[PDB]
Write a protein that holds these residues in place. Structure first.
Motif, PDB file in Angstrom:
ATOM      1  N   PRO A   1       0.854  -1.355  -0.015  1.00  0.00           N
ATOM      2  CA  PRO A   1       0.046   0.109  -0.059  1.00  0.00           C
ATOM      3  C   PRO A   1       0.914   1.408  -0.071  1.00  0.00           C
ATOM      4  O   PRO A   1       0.492   2.347  -0.436  1.00  0.00           O
ATOM      5  CB  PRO A   1      -0.751   0.149   1.203  1.00  0.00           C
ATOM      6  CG  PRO A   1      -0.405  -1.164   2.125  1.00  0.00           C
ATOM      7  CD  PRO A   1       0.571  -2.137   1.086  1.00  0.00           C
TER       8      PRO A   1
ATOM      9  N   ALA B   1      -4.019   4.435  -1.857  1.00  0.00           N
ATOM     10  CA  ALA B   1      -4.234   3.857  -0.676  1.00  0.00           C
ATOM     11  C   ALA B   1      -4.534   4.762   0.686  1.00  0.00           C
ATOM     12  O   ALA B   1      -3.662   5.552   0.736  1.00  0.00           O
ATOM     13  CB  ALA B   1      -2.865   2.766  -0.237  1.00  0.00           C
ATOM     14  N   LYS B   2      -5.399   4.221   1.524  1.00  0.00           N
ATOM     15  CA  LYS B   2      -5.280   4.890   2.799  1.00  0.00           C
ATOM     16  C   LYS B   2      -5.667   3.886   3.765  1.00  0.00           C
ATOM     17  O   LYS B   2      -6.707   3.233   3.848  1.00  0.00           O
ATOM     18  CB  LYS B   2      -6.621   5.868   2.670  1.00  0.00           C
ATOM     19  CG  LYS B   2      -6.774   6.787   4.249  1.00  0.00           C
ATOM     20  N   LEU B   3      -5.315   3.975   4.988  1.00  0.00           N
ATOM     21  CA  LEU B   3      -5.343   3.006   6.206  1.00  0.00           C
ATOM     22  C   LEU B   3      -6.623   3.235   6.711  1.00  0.00           C
ATOM     23  O   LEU B   3      -7.333   4.555   6.791  1.00  0.00           O
ATOM     24  CB  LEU B   3      -4.507   3.366   7.232  1.00  0.00           C
ATOM     25  CG  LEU B   3      -4.645   2.416   8.495  1.00  0.00           C
ATOM     26  CD1 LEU B   3      -4.014   1.036   8.122  1.00  0.00           C
ATOM     27  CD2 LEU B   3      -3.720   3.058   9.577  1.00  0.00           C
TER      28      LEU B   3
ATOM     29  N   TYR C   1      -6.886  -1.417   4.473  1.00  0.00           N
ATOM     30  CA  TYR C   1      -6.789  -0.357   3.478  1.00  0.00           C
ATOM     31  C   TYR C   1      -7.977  -0.164   2.527  1.00  0.00           C
ATOM     32  O   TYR C   1      -8.552  -0.903   2.530  1.00  0.00           O
ATOM     33  CB  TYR C   1      -5.631  -0.479   2.806  1.00  0.00           C
ATOM     34  CG  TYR C   1      -4.417  -0.305   3.471  1.00  0.00           C
ATOM     35  CD1 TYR C   1      -3.478   0.950   3.785  1.00  0.00           C
ATOM     36  CD2 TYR C   1      -3.817  -1.433   4.107  1.00  0.00           C
ATOM     37  CE1 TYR C   1      -2.503   0.892   4.464  1.00  0.00           C
ATOM     38  CE2 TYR C   1      -2.729  -1.635   4.866  1.00  0.00           C
ATOM     39  CZ  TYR C   1      -1.954  -0.375   5.105  1.00  0.00           C
ATOM     40  OH  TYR C   1      -0.985  -0.266   5.952  1.00  0.00           O
TER      41      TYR C   1
ATOM     42  N   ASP D   1      -8.582   1.453  -1.249  1.00  0.00           N
ATOM     43  CA  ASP D   1      -7.943   1.631  -2.209  1.00  0.00           C
ATOM     44  C   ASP D   1      -8.924   1.493  -3.647  1.00  0.00           C
ATOM     45  O   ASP D   1      -9.966   0.960  -3.470  1.00  0.00           O
ATOM     46  CB  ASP D   1      -6.839   0.855  -2.664  1.00  0.00           C
ATOM     47  CG  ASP D   1      -5.502   1.599  -3.280  1.00  0.00           C
ATOM     48  OD1 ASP D   1      -4.379   1.115  -2.893  1.00  0.00           O
ATOM     49  OD2 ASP D   1      -5.763   2.417  -3.980  1.00  0.00           O
TER      50      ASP D   1
END
Length: 330
Positions: free
Chosen positions: A61, A67-69, A90, A92
């Protein structure tokens, strides 16, 4: 919108099928096992315990600009065969066969069980059962299909699995060139989160059709056909030398046998599984005992129309407000 992707058997036995999936920006292509019996999209990743990775392609990621946690979210799943995986999450961009979903939950594996590690060809799973089975906590996530649904031309996907050959998953349309005759639709219960339906009966080889209701699930993530002990006994009784082996873990038969076909009912329609589809080959390399593709569901707790059954048909997973399942010959 629509999407169309080719799905390919992982080995000479059709033990499972992999379909390429693009994740992130720039695209990272992973080969995923599309599984209508579960509801998590999870991948081998840069976070997966190193000793548990053996040849898989991983999602990283940190190399994806989209991508974002998903802060605080974790997941953990256990499958019918005893395998398991778990990790964090994540969001995405995910595309299948040209169909793109933004903000898809991509579950990154921190741990995978041995069966996953040992399968170098499967980079993860893409669940296509109902989102109520998704394991993300504390905020349950939607499947790729659920996320795509509103954008699709028609709220459907189809599975067209090949016998020892590639096939196709389509999203958002029914390819009328991919099947013969008509599609027979049958009711679905979503009460257990599965594509659960009731077959109207069965026949063995050229035998007479037995009308009897068989409740089960359409599960592309299960290799074999698991049916009640009565039905399975009736099938294997037609194969000389076939027996149930507790040491092997199911029905085996002489590799010299010619297997009879198995027919299952879909309403008034019939799907015929050729005998060859039921041969899963020597139990161990060089053995003359072969493993059967029809096995008892006793002690599973559910009947499973796995790949052995589904690959004999063109199958419509209709995610309309009242879901249904359609089967056609092909």
């Amino acid at each position: 919108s629509t999407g169309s992707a080719t799905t390919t058997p992982i080995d000479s036995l059709d033990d499972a099928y992999i379909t390429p999936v693009q994740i992130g920006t720039p695209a990272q292509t992973l080969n995923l096992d599309f599984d209508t019996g579960s509801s998590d999209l999870w991948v081998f990743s840069s976070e997966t315990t190193a000793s548990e990775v053996d040849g898989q392609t991983i999602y990283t990621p940190s190399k994806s600009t989209t991508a974002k946690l998903l802060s605080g979210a974790t997941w953990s799943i256990s499958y019918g065969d005893g395998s398991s995986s778990s990790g964090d999450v994540y969001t995405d961009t995910v595309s299948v066969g040209g169909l793109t979903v933004t903000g898809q939950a991509v579950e990154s594996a921190k741990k995978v069980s041995s069966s996953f590690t040992e399968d170098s060809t499967i980079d993860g799973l893409l669940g296509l059962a109902f989102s109520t089975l998704n394991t993300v906590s504390p905020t349950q996530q939607k499947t790729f299909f659920d996320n795509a649904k509103a954008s699709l031309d028609s709220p459907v996907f189809t599975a067209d699995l090949g016998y020892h050959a590639p096939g196709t998953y389509n999203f958002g349309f029914i390819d009328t060139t991919a099947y013969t005759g008509s599609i027979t639709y049958t009711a679905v219960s979503t009460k257990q989160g599965f594509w659960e339906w009731t077959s109207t009966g069965y026949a063995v080889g050229s035998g007479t059709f037995k009308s009897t209701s068989i409740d089960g699930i359409a599960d592309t993530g299960t290799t074999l056909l698991y049916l009640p002990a009565t039905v399975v006994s009736a099938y294997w009784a037609q194969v000389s030398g076939a027996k149930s082996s507790s040491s092997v873990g199911g029905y085996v038969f002489p590799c010299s046998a010619t297997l009879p076909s198995f027919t299952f009912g879909v309403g008034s329609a019939r799907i015929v599984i050729p005998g060859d589809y039921i041969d899963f080959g020597p139990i161990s390399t060089g053995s003359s005992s072969c493993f059967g593709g029809i096995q008892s569901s006793a002690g599973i707790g559910i009947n499973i129309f796995g790949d052995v059954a589904l690959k004999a048909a063109f199958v419509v997973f209709n995610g309309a407000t009242t879901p249904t399942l359609g089967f056609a010959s092909k």
